[PDB]
């Protein structure tokens, strides 16, 4: 219990720091609903299971010259959790743009301090994707990849290489790509509807989409997205797997590149 331990209690601190970074940044782990004590205790109580079989020996220098080590762990956590947010942003884009088609957002068109559309359709699909994530192996693969980072990039004087934050920067990237690739059928069908009801204006310029168009397009959008709700379930697979691969890639890109 002395420093014969209490500097071997320096075995817990760095892995705890990395696990805590991931928890504070991860998609499900870092939700404001969880009491802060639960997240902290989960970090401590994961590292206690992972800390043995982690041969770590460093020093919390006074006026830390090894804070650049602490940085390292924090950064790796930011790598793992935050990137997994891209998969949600995608749908939080897709569904949002779907509203931007029907009628829901003409307040956001010509000008304000109130957006009012984030509550409407983006939070439908984003929490639907929340559940799709969790239902696997959602909560867990992030933690397993964190342990894998412990084993591939444990603790070192060369923590992070350049040319490797572009990977995450131009990664999304696939935020726009996948948001589209999901919302494309709905957008295309409502484009057809909008152009058709516009062509009605050729027979009579009085038909006034404000009067005719919006009630039609709202029903079309609601019914159609009801019909194309299940299409998300396969897409989320993609939407997570590829991003995992990216993380996996960078996690396994870093050791052979160091």
């Amino acid at each position: 219990t002395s420093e014969q331990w209490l500097y071997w209690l320096h075995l817990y601190f760095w892995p705890l720091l990395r696990v805590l970074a991931l928890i504070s940044t991860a998609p499900i782990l870092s939700e404001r609903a969880i009491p802060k004590r639960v997240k902290l205790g989960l970090g401590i109580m994961i590292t206690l299971v992972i800390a043995p079989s982690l041969p770590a020996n460093d020093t919390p220098l006074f006026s830390i010259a090894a804070l650049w080590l602490a940085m390292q762990q924090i950064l790796i956590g930011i790598a793992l959790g935050f990137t997994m947010q891209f998969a949600f942003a995608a749908v939080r884009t897709a569904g949002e743009f779907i509203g931007l088609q029907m009628g829901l957002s003409f307040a956001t068109f010509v000008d304000p301090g109130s957006h009012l559309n984030m509550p409407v359709l983006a939070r439908i699909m984003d929490m639907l994707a929340m559940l799709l994530f969790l239902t696997f192996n959602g909560h867990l693969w992030l933690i397993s990849l964190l342990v894998d980072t412990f084993h591939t990039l444990p603790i070192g004087s060369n923590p992070v290489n350049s040319n490797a934050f572009m990977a995450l920067a131009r990664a999304g990237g696939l935020i726009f790509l996948n948001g589209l690739m999901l919302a494309l059928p709905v957008i295309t069908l409502l484009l057809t509807l909008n152009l058709a009801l516009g062509l009605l204006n050729r027979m009579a310029p009085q038909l006034s989409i404000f009067v005719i168009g919006f009630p039609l397009t709202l029903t079309v959008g609601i019914m159609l997205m009801a019909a194309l709700m299940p299409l998300i379930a396969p897409f989320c697979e993609h939407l997570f797997s590829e991003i995992f691969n990216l993380l996996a890639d960078i996690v396994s890109e870093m050791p052979i590149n160091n």
Binding site: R92, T108, F109, H115, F165, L180, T188, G198, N201
Partner: protein, 209 residues
């Protein structure tokens, strides 16, 4: 040197100034303004800034300052570790690469104004300007550059808006709301050309030049 006193005051207080002063000292201002402006085009947010855009700007500025952080590391974190350089030459050696970085992006007449209103006398060379004058000048220059980049980004989406509205109104569509038609066209322009990579690469290149 300082004596187990002030060391771990200046450090913890420097960590306190980190998020505002140190982050707006270097980058992440230009990038964040450009990202927000790009979000104004293409319609609504559709990118959760508290979740994605801020982190993307954070990663991008890490990439951007990899060279200056590497040079800081070489000049200080080797020598300052345990020997022969102690927090006085360390401070100026570690200030040099960041200061060159900021001076290399500052408009050459921002510093003029901020010297002429700080009542600073002659400034002998580019290295003679102090951080007191360098900070606000760098911030103003970076705001100018961010607005320029945002304007260039607004160009093509403005073109798409006007051409789509023109097509709709010329084909007889008297009073259709061209914005909802244009938004998917905005997406198509932005994804077919692989727009995000172009944007981050162009920002990264233009940031130091």
């Amino acid at each position: 040197s300082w004596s187990l006193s002030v060391q771990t005051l200046v450090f913890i207080t420097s960590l306190t100034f980190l998020p505002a002063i140190l982050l707006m000292m270097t980058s992440f201002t230009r990038i964040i303004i450009v990202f927000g402006l790009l979000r104004n085009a293409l319609g609504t947010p559709s990118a959760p800034p508290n979740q994605v855009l801020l982190g993307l700007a954070l990663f991008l500025t890490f990439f951007i300052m990899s060279p200056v952080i590497d040079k800081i590391y070489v000049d200080a974190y080797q020598p300052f570790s345990e020997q022969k350089i102690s927090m006085q030459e360390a401070l100026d050696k570690g200030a040099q690469p960041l200061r060159a970085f900021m001076l290399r992006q500052t408009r050459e007449a921002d510093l003029a104004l901020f010297a002429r209103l700080a009542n600073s006398g002659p400034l002998q060379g580019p290295e003679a300007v102090p951080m007191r004058i360098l900070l606000p000048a760098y911030v103003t220059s970076e705001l100018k550059t961010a607005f320029q980049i945002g304007f260039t980004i607004f160009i093509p989406f403005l073109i798409i808006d006007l051409v789509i509205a023109s097509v709709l109104m010329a084909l007889g569509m008297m009073m259709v709301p061209p914005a909802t038609i244009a938004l998917p066209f905005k997406l198509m322009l932005f994804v077919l050309v692989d727009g995000w990579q172009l944007l981050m690469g162009s920002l990264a290149q233009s940031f130091y030049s």
